[PDB]
From a paper:
In this paper, we report the crystal structures of a lectin from Agrocybe aegerita, designated as AAL2, in its apo- and complex forms with GlcNAc and GlcNAcβ1-3Galβ1-4GlcNAc, as part of our endeavors to develop a system to facilitate the identification and purification of O-GlcNAcylated proteins. AAL2 was recently discovered from the fruit body of the edible mushroom A. aegerita. AAL2 was found to specifically bind nonreducing terminal N-acetylglucosamine (GlcNAc) moieties of either alpha- or beta-linkage and was reported to have the activity of inducing apoptosis in hepatoma cells in vitro as well as inhibiting hepatoma growth in tumour-bearing mice in vivo. The overall structure of AAL2 monomer is a single domain with the shape of cylindrical torus with a diameter of about 51Å and a height of about 27Å, showing a very regular, seven-bladed β-propeller fold formed by the blades packing in a circular array.
The structures of AAL2, AAL2-GlcNAc and AAL2-GlcNAcβ1-3Galβ1-4GlcNAc were determined at resolutions of 2.0Å, 2.1Å, and 2.0Å, respectively. There are two virtually identical AAL2 monomers arranged around a two-fold pseudoaxis of symmetry in an asymmetric unit in both the structures of AAL2 and AAL2-GlcNAc, and one AAL2 monomer in AAL2-GlcNAcβ1-3Galβ1-4GlcNAc, while the protein exists as monomers in solution as determined from its elution volume on a Superdex 200 10/300 GL column. The ligands we used were GlcNAc monosaccharide and GlcNAcβ1-3Galβ1-4GlcNAc, a trisaccharide showing very high affinity toward AAL2 in glycan array analysis. GlcNAcβ1-3Galβ1-4GlcNAc ligands are bound to the same pockets of AAL2, with the non-reducing terminal GlcNAc (1’-GlcNAc) adopted the same position as GlcNAc. The interactions between AAL2 and 1’-GlcNAc of the trisaccharide are identical to those with GlcNAc monosaccharide. Although there are several hydrogen bond interactions between AAL2, such as Lys138, and the LacNAc moiety after 1’-GlcNAc, AAL2 doesn’t demonstrate specific preference to the 2’-Gal or 3’-GlcNAc in all the six blades, since the interactions seem to be random. This result was rather unexpected based on the glycan array. However, our results have further proved that AAL2 recognizes the terminal non-reducing GlcNAc moiety of a polysaccharide. AAL2 was also shown via SPR to bind to the trisaccharide with a Kd value of 41.65 μM, which is close to that of GlcNAc, demonstrating that Gal-GlcNAc moiety beyond GlcNAc may not affect the binding between AAL2 and trisaccharide.
Numbering used by the authors: 3 to 404
């Protein structure tokens, strides 16, 4: 189940060779997954010191906007959305083209503090539409090919800042197939209910439906940051289940099809605030560590990397330390360093990659959820005196080849 969340707006293939994309100070640096990693400056734009880009005002992502199966550089900037197409041959277009005068800080009054902006193929046509949770609800710009985007259209008066009272500090809004039709639907962790809105197929979304009375700020006491929540396929049927890291551990509600969810159950007695897990220090992720199509729980704790394996049915084995690195004890801080759990080897078993203090480090999956010795991939993409500070730079893992 390919999903889109606030922390990871770019879906990464469970089986593939994830590339490094770094919106750095001077422009976009590409670290193509290859035998000899050689990061290069591809576009002199989308940057703090090239185009005047700011993490506080702008959004920078990767998506296939043309339908060639190549990942393009996309930037929600001031006057609109800019796209540097992947021209193949390891080159990106420079300068980019502005494909639409909306979804911008100036053009549209879009705010990182209030609104969300995603790129998703919600029509399943092979290229990414623009989907934004704005002021009055959900706005969609349909991708008509050739970088021609239709006007931003309000397709659902909900999940908005001024449409249902949605807040970044209280609520969560993801895209995921929860019905089982292969089409991304809207999933919203509101105040008292987890809601879903069905993808109607025509680029619009059905009125919100309350489906869970849990996983929310006023239903179970789930707080932003402290208790992270995730949409993921935990059974292998392609639908998104729901899993959160609460107080006493991880709670799961299983997708029973059509957006109907089973009862919320405690499946792992770990990864929660009761056992020291904190938002500021201990990032958690759902990834497939065994290549069976089921998401396992991965956590970067104090002493290093802990993993709880999925039994295959949404039930889990107990969490255990699998790596003595990438933790607090090894100098890792959320404020300065990045960490991702993605397949780098094409075996469908997620590997670990950390953008650390002075080097980008890696740990490969043996194919069964065990991890080998840490190797240094490059000196690039590391914090390095603020050369790659998260405040000014944005690092993503992405599949430039789709
Ligand atoms: C009336 C007025 O002066 N308003 C100010 C805005 O103009 C200003 O936005 C900057 O506006 C530029 C056009 O006047 C331009 O759109 C610029 O966007 C940048 O444009 C370049 C060239 O196309 C592009 O390469 C670059 O990527 C792009 N950067 C971003 C982030 O979009 C825009 O920033 C605004 C900010 O200074 O302040 C307003 O007062
Ligand atoms: C800080 C403050 O008090 N100001 C608030 C306004 O920011 C807020 O605004 C805006 O309302 C507009 C209608 O008067 C409009 O809905 C606007 O949204 C935008 O709508 C256009 C289409 O009409 C769309 O193209 C664009 O993408 C969309 N932008 C966003 C971000 O959704 C909206 O910002 C106002 C509520 O109306 O409340 C004020 O207090
Ligand atoms: C008193 C207290 O401690 N609890 C307050 C919450 O009740 C309150 O939440 C609002 O509760 C409503 C109950 O009828 C409702 O669930 C509302 O959620 C909104 O519901 C509509 C459909 O009815 C839906 O379209 C919309 O998307 C949804 N919005 C969200 C964000 O969930 C809910 O906000 C809360 C905020 O007022 O304050 C609590 O203190
Ligand atoms: C130090 C101490 O003992 N403090 C007590 C708290 O631990 C306790 O909080 C709650 O503990 C519950 C188990 O005893 C449980 O973990 C609960 O989490 C919530 O549990 C419900 C199901 O019971 C679940 O639906 C919900 O999703 C889940 N929420 C989260 C975010 O995990 C937890 O709040 C407190 C109240 O019982 O009492 C303290 O004395
Ligand atoms: C000017 C100065 O003295 N700065 C100090 C920082 O350098 C220091 O950070 C640590 O920097 C080290 C420089 O060699 C090193 O990069 C270290 O990174 C850790 O390296 C180990 C061994 O390869 C690796 O296993 C681990 O994963 C890795 N951790 C990270 C986050 O990359 C880094 O912690 C800082 C903390 O002591 O203090 C500064 O004063
Ligand atoms: C967040 C985390 O890693 N918690 C795990 C736990 O915690 C560490 C301890 O290993 C260490 O001794 O103290 C630090 C605080 O200074 C953390 O609390 O270790 C548990 C297993 O022993 C594990 O279940 C927790 O998830």
């Amino acid at each position: 189940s390919n999903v889109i969340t606030q922390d990871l707006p770019i879906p990464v293939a469970s089986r593939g060779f994830a590339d490094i994309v770094g919106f750095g100070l001077d422009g976009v640096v590409i670290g193509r997954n290859a035998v000899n990693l050689q990061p290069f400056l591809a576009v002199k734009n989308f940057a703090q010191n090239a185009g005047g880009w700011l993490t506080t005002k702008h959004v920078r992502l990767i998506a296939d906007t043309t339908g060639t199966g190549k990942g393009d550089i996309v930037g929600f900037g001031n006057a609109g959305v800019y796209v540097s197409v992947n021209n193949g041959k390891n080159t990106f277009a420079d300068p980019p083209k502005m494909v639409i005068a909306n979804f911008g800080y100036d053009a549209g009054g879009w705010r990182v503090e209030k609104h969300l902006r995603y790129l998703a193929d919600i029509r399943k046509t092979g290229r990414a539409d623009i989907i934004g949770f704005g002021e009055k609800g959900v706005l969609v710009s349909r991708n008509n090919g050739g970088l021609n985007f239709g006007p931003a259209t309000l397709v659902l008066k909900d999940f908005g800042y001024d449409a249902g009272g949605w807040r970044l500090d209280r609520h969560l809004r993801f895209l995921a197939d929860v019905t089982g039709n292969g089409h991304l639907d809207i999933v919203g962790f509101g105040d008292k209910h987890v809601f879903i809105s069905r993808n109607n197929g025509d680029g619009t979304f059905a009125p919100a439906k309350s489906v869970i009375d849990n996983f929310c700020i006023d239903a179970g006491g789930w707080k932003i940051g402290d208790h992270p929540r995730f949409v993921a396929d935990l059974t292998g049927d392609g639908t998104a289940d729901i899993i959160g890291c609460g107080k006493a551990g991880c709670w799961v509600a299983l997708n029973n099809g059509g957006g109907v969810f089973g009862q919320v159950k405690l499946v792992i007695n770990d990864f929660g605030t009761d056992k020291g897990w904190q938002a500021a220090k201990h990032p958690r992720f759902i990834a497939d560590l065994t290549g069976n199509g089921r998401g396992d729980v991965v956590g970067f704790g104090n002493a290093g990397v802990y993993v709880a394996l999925n039994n295959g049915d949404g039930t889990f084995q107990s969490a255990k330390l699998v790596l003595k690195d990438f933790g607090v004890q090894q100098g890792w801080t959320v404020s300065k360093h990045r960490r991702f759990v993605v397949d780098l080897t094409g075996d469908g078993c997620a590997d670990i990659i950390g953008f650390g203090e002075k080097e980008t480090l890696v740990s490969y999956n043996d194919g069964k959820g065990n991890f080998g010795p840490v190797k240094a991939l490059t000196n690039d993409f590391s914090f390095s005196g603020g050369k790659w500070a998260p405040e000014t730079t944005v690092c993503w893992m992405a599949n430039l080849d789709s």
